[PDB]
Design an enzyme around this catalytic site. Structure first.
Site, PDB file in Angstrom:
ATOM      1  N   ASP A   1       7.780  22.949  12.169  1.00  0.00           N
ATOM      2  CA  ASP A   1       8.574  24.145  12.551  1.00  0.00           C
ATOM      3  C   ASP A   1       9.655  23.772  13.556  1.00  0.00           C
ATOM      4  O   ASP A   1       9.462  22.851  14.339  1.00  0.00           O
ATOM      5  CB  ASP A   1       7.663  25.198  13.203  1.00  0.00           C
ATOM      6  CG  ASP A   1       6.974  26.143  12.183  1.00  0.00           C
ATOM      7  OD1 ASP A   1       6.817  25.800  10.998  1.00  0.00           O
ATOM      8  OD2 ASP A   1       6.510  27.207  12.610  1.00  0.00           O
TER       9      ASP A   1
ATOM     10  N   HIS B   1      -4.817  24.409  14.182  1.00  0.00           N
ATOM     11  CA  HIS B   1      -4.092  25.610  14.661  1.00  0.00           C
ATOM     12  C   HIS B   1      -4.625  25.993  16.064  1.00  0.00           C
ATOM     13  O   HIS B   1      -5.819  26.045  16.278  1.00  0.00           O
ATOM     14  CB  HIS B   1      -4.245  26.745  13.666  1.00  0.00           C
ATOM     15  CG  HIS B   1      -3.324  27.897  13.907  1.00  0.00           C
ATOM     16  ND1 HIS B   1      -3.452  28.729  14.994  1.00  0.00           N
ATOM     17  CD2 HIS B   1      -2.297  28.385  13.173  1.00  0.00           C
ATOM     18  CE1 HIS B   1      -2.537  29.683  14.925  1.00  0.00           C
ATOM     19  NE2 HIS B   1      -1.820  29.494  13.828  1.00  0.00           N
TER      20      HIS B   1
ATOM     21  N   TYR C   1      17.866  30.494  13.046  1.00  0.00           N
ATOM     22  CA  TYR C   1      17.014  29.448  13.609  1.00  0.00           C
ATOM     23  C   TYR C   1      17.773  28.153  13.948  1.00  0.00           C
ATOM     24  O   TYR C   1      17.191  27.216  14.486  1.00  0.00           O
ATOM     25  CB  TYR C   1      15.838  29.182  12.674  1.00  0.00           C
ATOM     26  CG  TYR C   1      14.702  30.160  12.804  1.00  0.00           C
ATOM     27  CD1 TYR C   1      14.887  31.545  12.604  1.00  0.00           C
ATOM     28  CD2 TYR C   1      13.423  29.717  13.132  1.00  0.00           C
ATOM     29  CE1 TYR C   1      13.823  32.428  12.724  1.00  0.00           C
ATOM     30  CE2 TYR C   1      12.361  30.601  13.256  1.00  0.00           C
ATOM     31  CZ  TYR C   1      12.559  31.950  13.043  1.00  0.00           C
ATOM     32  OH  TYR C   1      11.490  32.818  13.172  1.00  0.00           O
TER      33      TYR C   1
ATOM     34  N   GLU D   1       1.144  28.531   5.036  1.00  0.00           N
ATOM     35  CA  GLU D   1      -0.061  28.103   5.788  1.00  0.00           C
ATOM     36  C   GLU D   1      -1.379  28.321   4.988  1.00  0.00           C
ATOM     37  O   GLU D   1      -2.299  27.505   5.042  1.00  0.00           O
ATOM     38  CB  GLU D   1      -0.156  28.854   7.121  1.00  0.00           C
ATOM     39  CG  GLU D   1      -1.320  28.491   8.023  1.00  0.00           C
ATOM     40  CD  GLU D   1      -1.098  29.009   9.420  1.00  0.00           C
ATOM     41  OE1 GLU D   1      -1.519  30.165   9.664  1.00  0.00           O
ATOM     42  OE2 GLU D   1      -0.472  28.295  10.255  1.00  0.00           O
TER      43      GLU D   1
ATOM     44  N   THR E   1      -8.283  32.816   9.427  1.00  0.00           N
ATOM     45  CA  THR E   1      -7.449  33.729   8.636  1.00  0.00           C
ATOM     46  C   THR E   1      -6.993  33.091   7.314  1.00  0.00           C
ATOM     47  O   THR E   1      -5.854  33.253   6.910  1.00  0.00           O
ATOM     48  CB  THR E   1      -6.255  34.278   9.464  1.00  0.00           C
ATOM     49  OG1 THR E   1      -5.518  33.203  10.048  1.00  0.00           O
ATOM     50  CG2 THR E   1      -6.790  35.185  10.591  1.00  0.00           C
TER      51      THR E   1
ATOM     52  N   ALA F   1      16.226  24.779   9.632  1.00  0.00           N
ATOM     53  CA  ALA F   1      16.997  25.587  10.545  1.00  0.00           C
ATOM     54  C   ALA F   1      17.911  26.476   9.708  1.00  0.00           C
ATOM     55  O   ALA F   1      19.098  26.180   9.526  1.00  0.00           O
ATOM     56  CB  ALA F   1      17.786  24.692  11.460  1.00  0.00           C
ATOM     57  N   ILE F   2      17.351  27.571   9.229  1.00  0.00           N
ATOM     58  CA  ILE F   2      18.021  28.439   8.286  1.00  0.00           C
ATOM     59  C   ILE F   2      18.299  29.787   8.945  1.00  0.00           C
ATOM     60  O   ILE F   2      17.472  30.304   9.713  1.00  0.00           O
ATOM     61  CB  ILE F   2      17.199  28.515   6.985  1.00  0.00           C
ATOM     62  CG1 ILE F   2      17.201  27.131   6.328  1.00  0.00           C
ATOM     63  CG2 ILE F   2      17.769  29.539   6.026  1.00  0.00           C
ATOM     64  CD1 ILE F   2      16.271  26.975   5.150  1.00  0.00           C
TER      65      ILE F   2
HETATM   66  O1  LIG Z   1      14.960  32.747   9.340  1.00  0.00           O
HETATM   67  C1  LIG Z   1      14.236  31.717   9.334  1.00  0.00           C
HETATM   68  C2  LIG Z   1      12.844  31.829   9.188  1.00  0.00           C
HETATM   69  C3  LIG Z   1      12.097  30.655   9.197  1.00  0.00           C
HETATM   70  N1  LIG Z   1      12.707  29.473   9.316  1.00  0.00           N
HETATM   71  C4  LIG Z   1      11.934  28.206   9.313  1.00  0.00           C
HETATM   72  O2  LIG Z   1      10.574  28.376   8.925  1.00  0.00           O
HETATM   73  C5  LIG Z   1       9.685  28.051  10.029  1.00  0.00           C
HETATM   74  C6  LIG Z   1       8.523  29.040  10.033  1.00  0.00           C
HETATM   75  O3  LIG Z   1       8.916  30.291  10.585  1.00  0.00           O
HETATM   76  P1  LIG Z   1       8.461  30.719  12.066  1.00  0.00           P
HETATM   77  O4  LIG Z   1       8.577  29.555  13.041  1.00  0.00           O
HETATM   78  O5  LIG Z   1       9.133  32.004  12.507  1.00  0.00           O
HETATM   79  O6  LIG Z   1       6.881  31.010  11.883  1.00  0.00           O
HETATM   80  P2  LIG Z   1       5.828  31.307  13.097  1.00  0.00           P
HETATM   81  O7  LIG Z   1       5.771  30.108  13.978  1.00  0.00           O
HETATM   82  O8  LIG Z   1       6.327  32.508  13.875  1.00  0.00           O
HETATM   83  O9  LIG Z   1       4.572  31.562  12.340  1.00  0.00           O
HETATM   84  C7  LIG Z   1      10.610  28.032  11.275  1.00  0.00           C
HETATM   85  O10 LIG Z   1      10.123  27.269  12.422  1.00  0.00           O
HETATM   86  C8  LIG Z   1      11.896  27.518  10.657  1.00  0.00           C
HETATM   87  O11 LIG Z   1      11.847  26.085  10.500  1.00  0.00           O
HETATM   88  C9  LIG Z   1      14.106  29.378   9.464  1.00  0.00           C
HETATM   89  O12 LIG Z   1      14.669  28.271   9.549  1.00  0.00           O
HETATM   90  N2  LIG Z   1      14.833  30.505   9.458  1.00  0.00           N
HETATM   91 MN   LIG Z   2       7.173  28.589  14.346  1.00  0.00          MN
END
Ligand SMILES: O=c1ccn([C@@H]2O[C@H](COP(=O)(O)OP(=O)(O)O)[C@@H](O)[C@H]2O)c(=O)[nH]1
Ligand SMILES: [Mn+2]
Ligand SMILES: O=c1ccn([C@@H]2O[C@H](COP(=O)(O)OP(=O)(O)O)[C@@H](O)[C@H]2O)c(=O)[nH]1
Ligand SMILES: [Mn+2]
EC number: 2.4.1.40
Lengths: 293, 293
Positions: free
Chosen positions: B150, B172, B65, B242, B184, B61-62
């Site tokens: 996530d 996925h 988030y 990923e 992908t 949680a950065i």
């Molecule tokens: O500014 C950010 C970007 C990413 N994350 C972390 O990295 C994960 C992956 O990013 P994101 O969920 O946006 O990826 P997506 O699901 O859209 O592919 C997030 O769930 C968060 O745990 C975060 O904490 N802060």
């Molecule tokens: Mn995500």
């Protein structure tokens, strides 16, 4: 440690296509049930070779059952774990009577001399003790997995690393389509092997079990202890070691279950559609002739 | 050492009845594919409670988030490993922004203060390095299994011990029914994550993996090293962490695969019939705003 698999070319596993539609391929505790079509042997061979896996196979050839050794070992050479290190362990009262079977590279046979009990029931039952004893004496340092089978049998097709796992049992060919109430478990509450009518997952065959040395060590020790309590109580389990095996695998769930492809009798059962392969099969015998002096 | 299971009354597993006829329930390397209908949770809970299992759950949680944390945590309390020992690890640059969420008995939450990277790509990718670091620092001593997810997510249904195994990845939701050529994966041979058009079992999601601490340590360290090689080679993989997770799980096969019940987005994909439960699901978010100042 396990190194990376090399690049391999094989068909993609289709998520929306079941690998079998006619049989159960995974137990309710998430153990795979091993049928043809559920595995890609190429992948599994790679995994097990990259571990330098050595598989021990135990077989008892006591008194008249020395007669089954030649066909058992000759077919084992053709079908059992070909390409992997194998150590056969032949338990017998007649070391001189072990046939001189020519073995593939990386495969060795040891003769373990033991006593012949007079009663066939004891011969079959005391395999638990004997396996347990030699797990200490020999198998812990010599092999990674143990497979424990009956001798009055022949290999007809592939039996390989798809079966290997910490602990496995095999579906008895007589009961795989039966309801639990019809399973010939021990039903007398005074026996250590007792299973009540409303319990049981499968009826496992006494003629084919195994796993890691540690797990087989635990299973055979436990089954032997349960037999000794029964003996002290003046009770002998209805189906002997197979009964105590069933009790053990009920309370300690196996990590894979082998389909009846791995334990069959074609004379009594034919070759049904649900069996794509007949791998390990009964050799006809006359019980009363062969089990007594 | 494993104690016997107690007596349990439950429906008999039916050998000649498939548990699913619409989906693949076991991989060609004999790893279960976890769908509703494949497991009896009572037997599994018994198995894991008896081993006194502790499950760690890592979540990042950065920057902005932190907003997702409240719903993530409250729903985890409702649905994640209920009845088992749980240890949440919240990785954050804002320790004070972690919501005070009330926890069930045997459950605890630790805050892990880490740096914030500027780019969303680096925040996502750098989870591999941070998990790997803490695998040494805290996790090996503290928990038995790690679940790495996530944060932009909520639990909507049961996520329990059925997932636990030495190494797992999750299908996925966008690709489970795809041909491998449409996956992908990274396709540039210049990247460490490269997978050719003729290889690939599954497209695993970067938002849900785990396993034993030992196996997670290996995976995360490998994925971080691969990213650093790519960095030196001036290439960044197409789907970042990923892509690298997918290369890793191709060459080191997971011992369970979770179905898309475990990683879903109802907004994008609806509710198809092959999904009996939607367990862990994406919370709607706007990319443009949450990933940057
Ligand atoms: O500014 C950010 C970007 C990413 N994350 C972390 O990295 C994960 C992956 O990013 P994101 O969920 O946006 O990826 P997506 O699901 O859209 O592919 C997030 O769930 C968060 O745990 C975060 O904490 N802060
Ligand atoms: Mn995500
Ligand atoms: O006189 C005997 C009786 C039994 N056995 C061993 O114990 C196993 C189990 O006995 P059997 O095969 O007769 O049981 P069944 O398959 O007929 O129920 C045999 O396969 C042999 O390995 C043996 O070596 N000598
Ligand atoms: Mn027999």
């Amino acid at each position: 440690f396990m190194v990376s698999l090399p690049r391999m070319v094989y068909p993609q596993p289709k998520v929306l296509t079941p690998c079998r539609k006619d049989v159960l391929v995974v137990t309710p505790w998430l153990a795979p049930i091993v049928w043809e079509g559920t595995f890609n042997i190429d992948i599994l061979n790679e995994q097990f070779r990259l571990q330098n896996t050595t598989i021990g196979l135990t077989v008892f050839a006591i008194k008249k059952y020395v007669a089954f050794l030649k066909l058992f070992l000759e077919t084992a050479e053709k079908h059992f774990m070909v390409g992997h290190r194998v150590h056969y362990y032949v338990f017998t009262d007649q070391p001189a009577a072990v046939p001189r079977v020519t073995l593939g590279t990386g495969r060795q046979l040891s003769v373990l001399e033991v006593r012949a009990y007079k009663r066939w029931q004891d011969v079959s039952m005391r395999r638990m003790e004997m396996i347990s004893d030699f797990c200490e004496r020999r198998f812990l340092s010599e092999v990674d997995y143990l497979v424990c089978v009956d001798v009055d049998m022949e290999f007809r097709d592939h039996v390989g690393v798809e079966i290997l796992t910490p602990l496995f049992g095999t579906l008895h060919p007589g009961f795989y389509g039966s309801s639990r109430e019809a399973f010939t478990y021990e039903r007398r509450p005074q026996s250590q092997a007792y299973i009540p009518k409303d319990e049981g997952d499968f009826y496992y065959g006494g003629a084919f079990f195994g796993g890691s040395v540690q797990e087989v060590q635990r299973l055979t020790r436990a089954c032997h202890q349960a037999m000794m309590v029964d003996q002290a109580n003046g009770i002998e389990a209805v189906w002997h070691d197979e009964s105590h095996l069933n009790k053990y695998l009920l309370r300690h769930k196996p990590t894979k279950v082998l389909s009846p492809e791995y334990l069959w009798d074609q004379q009594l059962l034919g070759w049904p559609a649900v069996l794509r392969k007949l791998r390990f099969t009964a050799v006809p015998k006359n019980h009363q002739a062969v089990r007594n002096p």
